[PDB]
């Protein structure tokens, strides 16, 4: 009767709904009883420090478990042959065949083999021994403690920040651009130049010697003379064996481009020069805003003055400053949309341009990292649109936003939504129709009749960056071009070697199957956007429910009247778009993984011929690659893919269990539960035990969430088991 102490409406509920709803509304601090704005921003600040610490404890845990139980020192000796160990297994349910089957990695105990790539990342950035992985784990435990104490400290009465501090947009932007983005990128260049570059070249540099070991033989004298090009002189040779002194140069900043020939990763001197460039740029960008000394920009002044004189945007951005600052949901939506695009950039640029030594030969790690970050990307992008819907319901004031960009977006909400409906339908009808055309014609024994459309626009883009496969002779592909001549002395020789060589995932060859799947991804991104945009724009009202704002973000329905109002809330369009997010990241990761496993065999033509129809995707990707995974255990034994073999079935179960919450709805279950309440009260020896909370069926919104969680968890666990076990079992 007092668990949701933040909610008296839930704390007086006599049912089991109180526990569920108190657990599910716990982090929605804005909705808590008697919540002021001061207390809202100060609890968010302290709980952001708790998230900071959880991240640091998670990273310290990965470092500790690899330092303790991993084979990092064995792996760094021979990184292409040794399989990295994540942590050991102590499971009292194992049989002795299971214990023997997981005893890989060169150790004497069962282990999980790491798919996270942390070995390649820690190898590349300098770590050599278990002592420094452990030292990193210790330092992160200290930092986690520092940020937990900071979270407690900024909850103390003298140390409580005011709302004037929390909304100082200019000082926060100045410091996050110049200190958090820029100076830490500059400090990361210092780590590469001072530690990672020398230790990639055999010379150990630690805290014990880094003030008496110069990164460059000349040493901070060329920098303080303008002779900066002396830091690019004598780069690492193509004969360099990573981690050793043979083939090593003395340069610490280069723009060679392409990849280190042995590790098949970006040059660490390119990465050090990248973070130096991006650091200075971000530091300069962090001097943009006026704080205390009269130079800089006021964000209010910039936003108010950007109204085009033609009047096409109305009042423009007048009043957008206040809306953004006052609305934490508008900020969360901008932050999550921005972050979601970046983790999609992270997934796309880390497989094509890997930075870590001897990764991109760890095919399981490449598949897991790409799949992981694309799923994180889809979650962040859907959440951005969710919090835009929450912004419109909760924080958007139409009077304060008269004729703005925001009001005028709502004014044409139907033009936006109907054109997203058109483009979704357009793409879906044709992409599916071309795929079905191809399936029917191939089935009828006539593969030639297939509508195979070359991806010429993308091929032109590849050629424009120097791919010579398509013979476009555009820009970099043409030897005598202004673009080619300009970059010839700096990054083009390495880039042309990297792009033209077929040993890397840089600008991988694209054909008709690639075109069709890209259009499928376009239908998926447009359809998820349609559902999310329809939810955000119709969040505050619709013809079916004009006063939808008055009911909130997440409500079940408005009842069976007016024809029926199931899934009418903006939350329910989040709910419906979550399936479309899962479907699109499914199409993306299925495409990435199938194209890569076919290239990794040396059989890229198998994707080229089978991806243009859907039975090729069914038999040649899902059915063909299932066999190492589903044979992880059988009546003839088991091997170390048994865990993924069990997880794959576990994902199928959770996913299907989600269907129970999504297909079967409340009234059936409340009528079951009332017969169980009768039976418990009428059973002798059992009616001595009484519930404190009346058993009720799950709510309409709660069951939609429970089915969505089960569907999503089943989706993730099934695909993670498949993408890891098929790649591990195949090794290619």
């Amino acid at each position: 009767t007092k668990f949701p102490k933040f909610s008296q409406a839930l704390a007086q509920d006599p049912a089991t709904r109180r526990i569920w709803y108190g657990l599910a509304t716990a982090h929605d601090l804005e909705s808590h009883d008697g919540m002021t704005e001061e207390n809202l921003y100060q609890k968010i600040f302290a709980s952001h420090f708790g998230h900071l610490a959880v991240i640091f404890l998670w990273t310290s845990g990965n470092l500790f478990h690899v330092a303790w139980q991993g084979n990092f020192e064995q792996w760094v000796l021979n990184p292409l042959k040794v399989k990295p160990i994540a942590h050991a297994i102590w499971d009292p349910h194992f049989g002795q065949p299971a214990v023997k089957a997981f005893t890989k990695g060169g150790v004497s105990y069962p282990v999980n083999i790491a798919t996270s790539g942390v070995y390649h990342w820690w190898y590349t950035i300098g770590m050599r021994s278990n002592t420094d992985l452990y030292a990193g784990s210790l330092f992160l435990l200290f930092l986690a403690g520092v940020f937990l104490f900071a979270g407690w400290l900024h909850l103390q009465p003298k140390f409580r920040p005011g709302l004037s501090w929390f909304k100082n947009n200019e000082s926060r932007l100045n410091h996050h651009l110049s200190g958090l983005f820029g100076f830490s990128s500059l400090a990361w260049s210092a780590h590469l130049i001072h530690v990672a570059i020398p230790e990639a070249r055999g010379q150990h540099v630690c805290w014990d010697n880094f003030t008496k070991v110069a990164p460059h033989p000349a040493g901070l004298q060329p920098f303080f003379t303008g002779n900066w090009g002396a830091y690019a002189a004598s780069p690492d040779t193509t004969n360099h064996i990573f981690g050793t002194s043979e083939g090593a140069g003395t340069a610490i900043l280069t723009f060679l481009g392409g990849f280190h020939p042995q590790t098949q990763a970006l040059w660490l001197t390119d990465i050090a020069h990248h973070h130096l460039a991006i650091g200075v740029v971000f530091i300069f960008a962090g001097h943009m805003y006026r704080t205390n000394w009269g130079i800089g920009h006021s964000l209010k002044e910039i936003l108010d003055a950007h109204r085009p004189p033609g009047g096409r945007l109305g009042a423009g951005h007048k009043g957008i400053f206040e809306t953004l600052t006052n609305s934490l949901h508008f900020q969360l939506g901008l932050a999550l949309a921005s972050l979601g695009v970046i983790t999609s950039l992270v997934a796309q640029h880390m497989y094509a341009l890997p930075s870590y030594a001897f990764i991109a030969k760890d095919y399981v790690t490449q598949s897991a990292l790409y799949t992981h970050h694309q799923y994180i990307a889809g979650f962040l992008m859907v959440g951005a649109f969710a919090h835009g819907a929450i912004f419109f319901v909760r924080d958007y004031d139409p009077e304060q936003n008269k004729n703005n960009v925001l009001a005028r977006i709502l004014d044409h909400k139907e033009a936006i939504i109907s054109h997203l409906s058109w483009v979704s339908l357009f793409l879906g009808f044709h992409t599916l129709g071309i795929y079905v055309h191809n399936d029917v014609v191939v089935a009828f024994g006539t593969p030639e009749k297939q509508i195979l459309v070359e991806p010429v626009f993308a091929q032109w883009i590849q050629a424009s960056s120097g791919k010579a496969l398509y013979g476009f002779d555009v820009l970099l592909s043409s030897t005598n071009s202004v673009a080619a001549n300009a970059s010839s002395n700096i990054w083009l020789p390495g880039w042309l070697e990297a792009i033209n060589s077929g040993k890397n995932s840089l600008f991988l060859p694209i054909g008709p199957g690639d075109f069709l799947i890209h259009h499928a991804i376009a239908l998926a991104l447009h359809t998820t956007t349609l559902i999310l945009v329809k939810g955000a724009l119709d969040a505050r009202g619709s013809k079916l429910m004009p006063d939808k704002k008055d009911f909130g973000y997440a409500f079940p329905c408005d009842g069976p009247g007016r024809g029926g109002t199931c899934d009418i809330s903006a939350w329910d369009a989040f709910y419906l778009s979550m399936f479309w997010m899962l479907n699109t990241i499914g199409w993306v990761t299925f495409y990435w993984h199938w194209k890569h496993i076919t290239i990794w065999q040396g059989n890229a033509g198998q994707f080229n011929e089978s991806s243009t129809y859907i039975m090729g995707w069914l038999r040649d990707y899902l059915w063909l690659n299932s066999s190492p995974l589903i044979n992880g255990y059988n009546p003839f034994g088991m091997n170390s893919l048994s865990v993924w073999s069990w997880m794959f079935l576990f994902g199928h179960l959770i996913w299907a269990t989600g269907f129970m919450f999504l297909i079967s709805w409340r009234g059936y279950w409340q009528e079951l539960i009332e017969t169980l309440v009768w039976a418990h009260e009428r059973t002798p020896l059992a009616n001595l035990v009484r519930w404190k909370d009346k058993p009720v069926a799950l709510s309409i919104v709660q069951a939609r969430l429970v089915g969505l969680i089960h569907f999503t968890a089943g989706y993730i666990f099934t695909y993670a088991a498949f993408v890891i076990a098929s790649t591990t079992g195949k090794f290619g």
Partner: peptide, 30 residues
Amino acid sequence: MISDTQIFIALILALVSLVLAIRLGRALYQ
């Protein structure tokens, strides 16, 4: 390799982090 003493130092620092986590959680809960 990592000593048992080194693991115990890590466990000491994680206990200190646990106590600071309890103190932050109680402060956030009020």
